[PDB]
Swiss-Prot record:
Pfam families: Globin
EC number(s) recorded for this UniProt protein: 1.7.-.-, 1.11.1.-
GO terms under biological process: oxygen transport; removal of superoxide radicals
Annotated positions binding heme b: 93
Chain positions found as Phosphoserine: 3
Source organism of the structure: Sus scrofa (Pig)
Gene Ontology molecular function, alphabetical: heme binding; metal ion binding; nitrite reductase activity; oxygen binding; oxygen carrier activity; peroxidase activity
Protein name in the entry: Myoglobin
Oligomer status and interactors: Monomeric.
Sites where the protein binds O2: 64
CDD domains, per database record: Mb (cd08926)
Keywords: Cytoplasm, Heme, Iron, Metal-binding, Muscle protein, Oxidoreductase, Oxygen transport, Phosphoprotein, Transport
Stated family: Belongs to the globin family.
Residues noted as binding nitrite in the record, renumbered to the chain: 64
Length: 153
């Protein structure tokens, strides 16, 4: 439900994430987990990380942050017409990973915080609002696929 100008703002800021996907992805997952400890429980591979220092050293965390943001990028670039890219994620997250829609709100928050943390200058009021709308559209369409699959939206 974004305008074409709002999509341009989202994709222009996503360009900075593309110049360093893994670094951004690492930072998002650390922010998600240090802000919201219970989300870490969903990642069987990351239990043993007992500190932000262990999380920073974890090559599997960095790899997972990279995979996560590469996929999100794939969704953003389709500007709303992302059914095909969204379905497999909704499927895998609704079933196997057991991710609640609310946790999608926490990682949305971490993405914004990271963008703000790393690009204060480029991530102004307009870019922020546009990214918020893009992530809300993502969250909303994830929730609607979950309902369709028979899960709580
Ligand atoms: C921007 C939102 C998200 C995106 C783009 C995303 C993307 C992905 C991708 C591409 C994978 C690998 C393929 C698949 O299994 O579907 C994955 C796996 C996974 N996701 Fe997500 N995800 C998101 C949010 C979350 C959240 C909020 C959680 C937990 C709080 C989560 C937990 C997991 C887990 C546990 C796996 C499997 C990891 C493993 O190998 O151990 N995801 N996600």
């Amino acid at each position: 439900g974004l305008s074409d100008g709002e999509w341009q703002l989202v994709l222009n800021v996503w360009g900075k994430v593309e110049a360093d996907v893994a670094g951004h992805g690492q930072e998002v997952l650390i922010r998600l987990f240090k802000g919201h400890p219970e989300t870490l429980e969903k990642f069987d591979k990351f239990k043993h990380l007992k500190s932000e220092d262990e999380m920073k050293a974890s090559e599997d965390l960095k790899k997972h942050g990279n995979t996560n943001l590469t996929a999100l990028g794939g969704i953003l670039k389709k500007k709303g017409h992302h059914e095909a890219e969204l379905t497999p994620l909704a499927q895998s997250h609704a079933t196997k990973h057991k991710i609640p829609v609310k946790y999608l709100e926490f990682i949305s928050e971490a993405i914004i915080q990271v963008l703000q943390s790393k690009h204060p200058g480029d991530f102004g009021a307009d870019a922020q609002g546009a990214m918020s709308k893009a992530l809300e559209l993502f969250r909303n369409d994830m929730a609607a696929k979950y309902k369709e699959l028979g899960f709580q939206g």
